[PDB]
Copies of this chain bind each other. A is one copy, B any other.
Amino acid sequence: MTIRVAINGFGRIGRNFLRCWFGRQNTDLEVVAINNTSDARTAAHLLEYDSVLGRFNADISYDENSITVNGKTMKIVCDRNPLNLPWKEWDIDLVIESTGVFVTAEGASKHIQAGAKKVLITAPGKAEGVGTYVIGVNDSEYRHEDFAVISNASCTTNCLAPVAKVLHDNFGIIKGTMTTTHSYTLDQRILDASHRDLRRARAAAVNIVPTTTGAAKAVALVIPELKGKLNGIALRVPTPNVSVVDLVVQVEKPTITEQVNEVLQKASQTTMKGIIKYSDLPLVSSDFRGTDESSIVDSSLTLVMDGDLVKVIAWYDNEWGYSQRVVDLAELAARKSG
């Protein structure tokens, strides 16, 4: 039926998640609270005007400590300490952790101590303790009691995994490598400034910047048969949104370009309907802004070297597509609370 949801960290994913939610047909979610760093005024304003999604077409208003959208009112709070949040009193079942700062089991659990029952990290979990799910890959393995702290993995892993599942099922992945040409994010710097990563420290809009990614190793979390078989890197480039994955895998079953495309397209219409979009048009990155699928296979770019070495390129709106999946995963949690 319905679970009460609160969003912690009203940033890119936070606001994207909200909009996705409001565009949904039906839902078992009731967003009742938002925890942010600024005021209610700033939350309503950044929710309405988005440099990438454009203006949110909806009735948006706000007051000293809440925001209202199309009639639904959501309390606004602002505590940098999750432990101080009124989750218990507000009867919060599920908190969407999208602050980027409570990604460990303990960290994210501070919301449990504060009263919530389950928390969903909109990012990879760090350390042990969190269950990871990727809609369309291991979602049938979701059990309510497994973890109070779950993760929807990263945007890159959500694009990568579905395609890896289809590629592995039909040809058998022996080993593979991947590179993601990714839009810059708020974790990078607009101009040269210190950062734990000497590369993300550099002016994002004027540099192609290499950076590590755990996305390839992470698919093992949702497709255990691929443990230690994949890896790769990331290249952050000067675009504000949408990215693309370049996956190269040595396959076990010799095949041909027309065929890997055939199965990927087959899957986009059936088993990965809604998860994998099959695009055979000569399109560019900004053409996928707002696409709901987690992986957008660009068919005309598929390539097979000597029968067993395949390359597939898949696009993804790392903000919106991902948020659609975190919505799906929350909805999945809803369809089985306690």
A residues adjacent to B (C-beta < 8 A):
11-12, 36-38, 42, 45-46, 49-52, 54-55, 174-177, 179, 181, 184-186, 188-194, 197-199, 201-210, 229-233, 235, 237-240, 242-244, 246, 248, 250, 281-287, 289-290, 298, 301, 303, 305-306, 309, 311, 313
Contact = CB atoms under 8 A, between A and B. Distances in A.
Given A12-B192, A239-B208, A306 B175 contact: yes
Given A54-B289, A194-B42, A250-B250, A207 B177 contact: no
Contacts of A49: 192, 202, 281, 283-284, 287
Nearest to A244: B208
Contacts of A193: 11-12, 46, 186
Q: How many copies does the complex hold?
A: 4
A233 B243 CA distance: 16
Contact of A286 (B181, B207, B232, B306): B207
Contacts of A287: 49, 51, 55
A287 B209 CA distance: 10
A286 B51 contact: yes
Given A177-B311, A207-B286, A231-B303, 5 more contacts: A49-B202, A54-B289, A177-B248, A181-B237, A185-B191
B184 A190 contact: yes
B190 A233 contact: no
A205 B238 contact: yes
Contacts of A285: 207-209
Which residue of A188, A189, A206, A229 has the most chain B CB atoms within 10 A of its CB atom? A206
A175 B311 CA distance: 12
A145 to B, nearest CB: 36
Contact of A190 (B190, B230, B250, B286): B190
A177 B37 contact: no
A41 to B, nearest CB: 8
A214 to B, nearest CB: 14
A258 B107 CA distance: 36
Which residue of A46, A50, A203, A303 has the most chain B CB atoms within 10 A of its CB atom? A203
Task: Kindly list the 6 A-B residue pairs having the minimum CB-CB distance in the complex, ordered from nearest.
Answer: A205-B205, A208-B285, A38-B194, A238-B238, A51-B203, A198-B282
